[PDB]
Design a protein around this ligand. Structure first.
Ligand SMILES: *[C@@H]1O[C@H](CO)[C@@H](O[C@@H]2O[C@H](CO)[C@@H](O)[C@H](O)[C@H]2NC(C)=O)[C@H](O)[C@H]1NC(C)=O
Ligand SMILES: *[C@@H]1O[C@H](CO)[C@@H](O[C@@H]2O[C@H](CO)[C@@H](O)[C@H](O)[C@H]2NC(C)=O)[C@H](O)[C@H]1NC(C)=O
Ligand SMILES: *[C@@H]1O[C@H](CO)[C@@H](O[C@@H]2O[C@H](CO)[C@@H](O)[C@H](O)[C@H]2NC(C)=O)[C@H](O)[C@H]1NC(C)=O
Ligand SMILES: *[C@@H]1O[C@H](CO)[C@@H](O[C@@H]2O[C@H](CO)[C@@H](O)[C@H](O)[C@H]2NC(C)=O)[C@H](O)[C@H]1NC(C)=O
Ligand SMILES: *[C@@H]1O[C@H](CO)[C@@H](O[C@@H]2O[C@H](CO)[C@@H](O)[C@H](O)[C@H]2NC(C)=O)[C@H](O)[C@H]1NC(C)=O
Ligand SMILES: *[C@@H]1O[C@H](CO)[C@@H](O[C@@H]2O[C@H](CO)[C@@H](O)[C@H](O)[C@H]2NC(C)=O)[C@H](O)[C@H]1NC(C)=O
Ligand SMILES: *[C@@H]1O[C@H](CO)[C@@H](O)[C@H](O)[C@H]1NC(C)=O
Ligand SMILES: *[C@@H]1O[C@H](CO)[C@@H](O)[C@H](O)[C@H]1NC(C)=O
Ligand SMILES: *[C@@H]1O[C@H](CO)[C@@H](O)[C@H](O)[C@H]1NC(C)=O
Lengths: 199, 590
C-alpha cells in the first residue's frame, strides 16, 4: 500500500550488537533491491527461504535488526556456535524464515555516522559463593545485562556491576569503512498478507 | 542475625566480587611486560602485583575469624582452607629475612656457573655451553671434566647454604601443624570426602613405592639394552653386568636419556617421519597451524576459541623492534581472556607444541564458571597431563596421513613402530627412577632419617640400588651433587613429574577404549569422536572443587593411580627387548 521508510535505518549511528535496534514493519510496500543497492552485500545466508522469494512474497509483518558488526567475525553469527556472541549478545530465532545480510557501508553514503569502536559483551552473569551463574540469551531477545552495559565501555574487559549482576565489554577500533549486519525476519499471516512488494 | 556458615558465604561473595577485577590487572600488566620488555613495563607489573598482594593479605587476615570445624559444606570449607593458610609468616623477622636471603643466594650461585678445563684454561663455558658440550660429545675425557667441574664448582658451595635452608624450612613447616617440609610438600595430594575418595599425606609414599615396584622390570630391560649399546660405544670402560657411569647418560644430570638415541638405535635403515618439508611445500604459516589445531579440538566436541584469541595472542615473533621471551606459554588472564605467547616456526616440532599449548586453553575454558580460588587443575600434575595426552593423538600416522601431510602410500612396518616406541621410552621410562630417587632422598633428608654426615653416602647408594648408575670419581662428604640441579637449588617439588606420566597413559587408555579402538594402544587416535570429548569435558569442568580421586573416576573409572596402562603402551617394546637382550638383565651394586 504505502511506502515504508528506511531513514530510521539510514541515519544516526548504528548501535553495538548487544543493544541492537528493531525495525518492525506492518502494512506497507517494500522494495528491498532499493535498500540492498546502497550497500556492498558480502553475505546473504538465508534459512527456510531463498533470496529470490524474499523480495516477491506478501507477508503480514516484516522485521529488521541492524547493528554495527565487522565482517571479520562472520563465523560467530552462524546458527549453532556457542560463542561469546550467540550466548551473550544476539541469538537468532529460527522458528520463522530469516535472512542475514552483512554490508560494507560505503564512503558515498554520508548519512551514516561512523562510531568510535566496535563492541560486544564477553560475559554476563550473577555471582554466588560457589562460582558464576551465567545468564544466556533468548532467541530474538535482549541480554539481561543491558541496563548495566549502557554506561559505556572505555577499555578492553571493563566490568560493570549493580548488586549481583555483572557484565564485561570488549572494544576495538574502526579501520576503513563501516560494516553492518541486517537480520531480516518475515512472518506469514493466516488471512491478511499486507506487506507486499512495491508495484 | 546469621550463623557462621552464612557469614562465611557473605565473606566469600565479597571476596569473589573484588578478586576478579583486581587479578586481571595484575595479569595484563605481566602480559604487557613478557611481550614487550622495557623498563617502563617492568614497573607497572610490580605496582599491580603489590596491589594484588595487599588485597590478598588483608582478605587472608579477615578469613581467620571463621573456625574451620563449624563449616558443613565442602566447597566453602575448601575455599577457606586455601585462604587461611599462614604460610611462611610464622617465623620471626630475623628468620624470615635470613630465609629470603638464603633462597636467592642459592639461585644466584646456581645461575652464574663457570667451569674451566684442567687442560689449557682459556675456555670457561657458562651453563648453556656445558649443557651443549655433554649433549653431543662422544669422548670419555671431555664429559668427565665437565661433570666433575660442574659438581665441584657449584655443588661445593651450595652445601653450607643447603644445610641452613633445610633447618629453616623445617622450622617454617612446624608452625602450620606439619612434621617436616616433606609433609608440607605431600599435602598437595591430600583430599577429604566420603568413603573411598579420601587421600592422606602418609599414603603418597606407599603409593609411589607400589607404582615404582610395578614399573621396574621394563626399566631393567631398557637399562640392559642401553648398557649393551654403550659397551659398543665406549670400549673397556663399562662392566658387562655392572652399573652405567654417570657421565655418559646423555646430559649433565642423567635426567632424560633422549640423547642416547643415536647410540642405542634399533635397525637404523628407516628414515623417520619428518613432515617439515611437506609443510613448507604447502606454504603453512603460524595461523594455519593454529587453525588446524582448533579444527582438531572441534572435531572431538570441545568449543572453539574466543574472538579475542586471534587478536591479542603473540603467535609469531615480532619485527617492529620489540624484545620478547620465546618460551611457549598459555595464559588465563581473567574475564574470558585467553591468550597464547609462542614464537612459532614452521616445523614439525612446533606443530605438536601448538596442540599441546592449546590443550591448556581448552582446560582453562572449562572450569571458568567456578570460584576464584578453585580455578586450577585437580592436582599439580593434572594440567600438564591433559595437554600431553592430546599430543599423542596427533603424532600418529593415523592422523598425519588424514590431514594431507603424509602421502597415502606409507609403510607402517613393525621396524618403524619399534623405532618410535624406543624413542618414546628413552624420554618417558628413563626418567622415572631418577625422579622417584631424587624425591625419596629429599623426603628422607627433610624427615631427619639421613643426618648431615650421610648426604653423599646415601645419595650414591640410592643411585646404585634404584637408578643403577655409578659415579666416576669418589665424592666424599663435602660435595652436594643433588644441589647442582635446577629444581633443588630453586626450591621446587619434583613428584609432579612422576604423578603426571602415570595419569597420561591412564587418560589415554580410557579415552581410546571409549572411542572404540581396535589394535595396540600406540596407534590410537581420538579425533572425529564426540564420545571421548564428553568424558574429557566431564573431568575438565570440575576444576579444583572436587577431590581429585573423584575427577579421576570421571575418566578412568578407577580412583587409584596404577601403572598398568603404562605397560600396555610399551608392550611391543617390552616383548622385543626380552628377545634382544636375553638373560643379561640386572646389575650388581658396585
Ligand atoms: C526498486 O528500487 C530500484 C532502485 O535501484 C528501482 O530502480 C531500478 O533498479 C533496476 C535494478 O538495477 C534498474 O535496472 C533500473 O534502471 C532502476 N530504475 C531507475 C529509474 O533507477 C526499481 O524500479 C525499484 N523496483 C520497482 C518495482 O519499482
Ligand atoms: C558451572 O557450570 C556447570 C556446567 O554447566 C554447572 O554444572 C552443572 O549444571 C547443570 C545445570 O544444567 C546440572 O544439572 C549439573 O548437575 C551440574 N554439574 C555439576 C558437576 O555441578 C554449574 O552449576 C555451574 N555453576 C553454578 C554455580 O551454577
Ligand atoms: C612497548 O613498551 C613501550 C614502553 O616504553 C611503549 O612505548 C609507549 O607507548 C605508549 C602508547 O603506545 C606511549 O603513550 C608512550 O609514550 C610510549 N613510551 C615511550 C617511552 O615511547 C610501546 O608502545 C610498547 N610497544 C607496543 C607495540 O605497544
Ligand atoms: C595463622 O596465624 C595466626 C597468627 O598470626 C593464628 O591466629 C592465632 O590463633 C590463636 C588460636 O589458637 C589465638 O589464640 C591467637 O590470638 C591468634 N593470633 C592472632 C595474631 O590473631 C591462626 O590461628 C593461624 N591459623 C592457622 C590455620 O595456622
Ligand atoms: C581414607 O580414610 C580411611 C579412614 O576412614 C583410611 O582407613 C584407615 O587406614 C589406616 C591405615 O593406616 C588403618 O589403620 C585404619 O584402620 C583405616 N580405617 C578404617 C576405618 O578402615 C583410609 O586408609 C584412607 N584412604 C586413603 C587412600 O588414604
Ligand atoms: C574427520 O572426519 C571428517 C569428515 O568425516 C574428515 O573430513 C573429510 O576427509 C576426507 C578425506 O578422505 C576429505 O576428502 C573430505 O573433503 C573431508 N571433508 C571435510 C568436510 O573436510 C576428516 O579428514 C577426518 N579427520 C581425521 C583425522 O580422520
Ligand atoms: C559516488 O558515486 C558516484 C556516482 O554515483 C561515483 O562517480 C563516485 O566515485 C562515488 N564516490 C566514491 C567516493 O566512491
Ligand atoms: C643424532 O643424529 C642426528 C642425525 O644423524 C644429528 O642431527 C644429531 O645432531 C645427533 N645428535 C647427537 C646427540 O649425536
Ligand atoms: C617384525 O619385523 C621382523 C623383521 O625383523 C619380521 O621378520 C617380522 O615378520 C615382523 N613381525 C610380524 C608380525 O610380521
Amino acid at each position: 500500500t504505502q511506502e515504508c521508510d528506511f531513514t530510521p535505518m539510514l541515519t544516526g549511528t548504528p548501535p553495538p550488537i548487544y543493544n541492537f535496534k528493531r525495525l518492525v514493519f506492518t502494512n506497507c510496500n517494500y522494495n528491498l533491491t532499493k535498500l540492498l543497492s546502497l550497500f556492498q552485500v558480502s553475505e546473504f545466508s538465508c534459512h527456510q527461504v531463498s533470496p529470490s522469494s524474499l523480495a516477491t512474497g506478501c507477508y503480514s509483518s516484516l522485521t529488521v535488526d541492524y547493528f554495527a558488526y565487522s565482517t571479520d567475525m562472520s563465523s560467530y553469527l552462524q546458527p549453532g556456535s556457542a560463542g561469546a556472541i550467540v550466548q551473550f549478545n544476539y541469538k537468532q530465532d529460527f522458528s520463522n524464515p530469516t535472512c542475514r545480510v552483512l554490508a560494507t557501508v560505503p564512503q558515498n553514503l554520508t548519512t551514516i555516522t561512523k562510531p568510535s569502536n566496535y563492541a560486544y559483551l564477553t560475559e554476563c552473569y550473577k555471582t554466588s559463593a560457589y562460582g558464576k551463574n551465567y545468564l544466556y540469551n533468548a532467541p530474538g531477545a535482549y541480554t539481561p545485562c543491558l541496563s548495566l552495559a549502557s554506561r559505556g565501555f572505555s577499555t578492553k574487559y571493563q566490568s560493570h556491576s549493580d548488586g549481583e549482576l555483572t557484565t564485561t565489554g570488549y572494544i576495538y577500533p574502526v579501520t576503513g569503512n563501516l560494516q553492518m549486519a541486517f537480520i531480516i525476519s518475515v512472518q506469514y499471516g493466516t488471512d491478511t498478507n499486507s506487506v507486499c512488494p512495491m508495484q | 542475625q546469621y550463623t557462621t556458615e552464612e557469614e562465611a558465604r557473605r565473606f566469600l561473595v565479597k571476596f569473589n566480587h573484588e578478586a576478579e577485577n583486581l587479578s586481571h590487572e595484575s595479569a595484563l600488566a605481566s602480559w604487557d611486560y613478557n611481550t614487550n620488555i622495557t623498563d617502563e613495563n617492568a614497573k607497572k607489573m610490580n605496582e599491580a602485583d603489590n596491589k594484588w598482594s595487599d588485597f590478598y593479605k588483608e582478605q587472608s587476615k579477615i578469613a581467620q575469624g571463621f573456625p574451620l570445624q563449624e563449616i558443613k559444606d565442602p566447597i566453602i570449607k575448601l575455599q577457606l582452607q586455601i585462604l587461611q593458610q599462614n604460610g611462611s609468616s610464622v617465623l620471626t623477622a630475623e628468620k624470615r629475612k635470613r630465609l629470603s636471603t638464603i633462597l636467592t643466594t642459592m639461585s644466584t650461585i646456581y645461575s652464574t656457573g663457570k667451569v674451566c678445563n684442567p687442560n689449557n684454561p682459556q675456555q670457561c663455558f657458562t651453563l648453556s655451553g656445558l649443557e651443549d658440550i655433554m649433549e653431543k660429545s662422544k669422548d670419555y675425557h671431555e664429559r668427565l671434566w665437565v661433570w666433575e667441574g660442574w659438581r665441584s664448582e657449584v655443588g661445593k658451595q651450595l652445601r653450607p647454604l643447603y644445610e641452613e635452608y633445610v633447618e629453616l624450612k623445617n622450622e617454617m613447616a612446624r608452625g602450620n601443624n606439619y612434621k617436616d617440609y616433606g609433609d608440607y610438600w605431600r599435602g598437595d595430594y591430600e583430599t577429604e570426602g566420603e568413603k573411598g575418595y579420601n587421600y592422606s599425606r602418609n599414603y603418597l609414599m606407599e603409593d609411589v613405592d607400589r607404582i615404582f615396584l610395578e614399573i621396574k622390570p621394563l626399566y631393567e630391560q631398557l637399562h640392559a639394552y642401553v648398557r649393551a649399546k654403550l659397551m659398543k660405544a665406549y670400549p673397556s670402560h663399562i662392566s658387562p653386568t655392572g652399573c652405567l657411569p654417570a657421565h655418559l647418560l646423555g646430559d649433565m644430570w642423567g635426567r632424560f636419556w633422549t640423547n642416547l638415541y643415536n647410540l642405542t638405535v634399533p635397525l637404523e635403515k628407516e628414515p623417520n617421519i619428518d613432515v617439515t618439508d611437506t609443510m613448507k611445500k604447502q606454504s603453512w604459516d603460524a595461523e594455519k597451524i593454529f587453525k588446524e589445531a582448533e579444527k582438531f579440538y572441534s572435531s572431538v566436541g570441545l568449543p572453539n576459541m574466543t574472538p579475542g584469541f586471534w587478536r591479542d595472542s603473540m603467535l609469531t615473533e615480532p619485527s617492529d623492534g620489540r624484545q620478547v621471551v620465546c618460551h611457549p606459554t598459555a595464559w588465563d588472564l581473567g574475564k574470558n581472556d585467553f591468550r597464547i605467547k609462542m614464537c612459532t616456526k614452521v616445523t614439525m616440532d612446533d606443530f605438536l607444541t601448538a596442540h599441546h599449548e592449546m590443550g591448556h586453553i581448552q582446560y582453562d575454558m572449562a572450569y571458568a564458571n567456578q570460584s576464584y580460588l578453585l580455578r586450577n587443575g585437580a592436582n599439580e600434575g593434572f594440567h600438564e597431563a591433559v595437554g600431553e595426552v592430546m599430543s599423542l593423538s596427533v603424532a600418529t600416522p593415523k592422523h598425519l596421513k588424514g590431514m594431507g601431510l603424509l602421502p597415502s602410500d606409507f609403510s607402517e612396518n613393525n621396524e618403524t613402530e619399534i623405532n618410535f616406541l624406543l624413542k618414546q621410552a628413552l624420554t618417558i621410562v628413563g626418567t622415572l627412577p631418577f625422579t622417584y630417587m631424587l624425591e625419596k632422598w629429599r623426603w628422607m633428608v627433610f624427615e631427619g632419617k639421613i643426618p648431615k654426615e650421610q648426604w653423599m653416602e646415601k645419595w650414591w647408594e640410592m643411585k646404585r640400588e634404584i637408578v643403577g648408575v655409578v659415579e666416576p670419581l669418589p665424592h666424599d662428604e663435602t660435595y652436594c651433587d643433588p644441589a647442582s640441579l635446577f629444581h633443588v637449588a630453586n626450591d621446587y617439588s619434583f613428584i609432579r613429574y612422576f604423578t603426571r606420566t602415570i595419569l597420561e597413559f591412564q587418560f589415554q587408555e580410557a579415552l581410546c577404549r571409549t572411542a572404540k579402538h581396535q589394535g595396540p594402544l600406540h596407534k590410537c587416535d581420538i579425533s572425529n569422536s564426540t564420545e571421548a570429548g564428553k568424558k574429557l569435558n566431564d573431568m575438565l569442568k570440575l576444576g579444583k572443587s572436587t577431590p581429585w580421586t573423584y575427577a579421576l573416576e570421571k575418566i578412568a573409572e578407577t580412583k587409584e593411580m596404577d601403572a598398568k596402562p603404562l605397560l600396555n603402551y610399551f608392550n611391543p617394546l617390552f616383548r622385543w627387548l626380552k628377545e634382544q637382550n636375553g638373560n643379561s638383565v640386572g646389575w650388581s651394586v658396585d
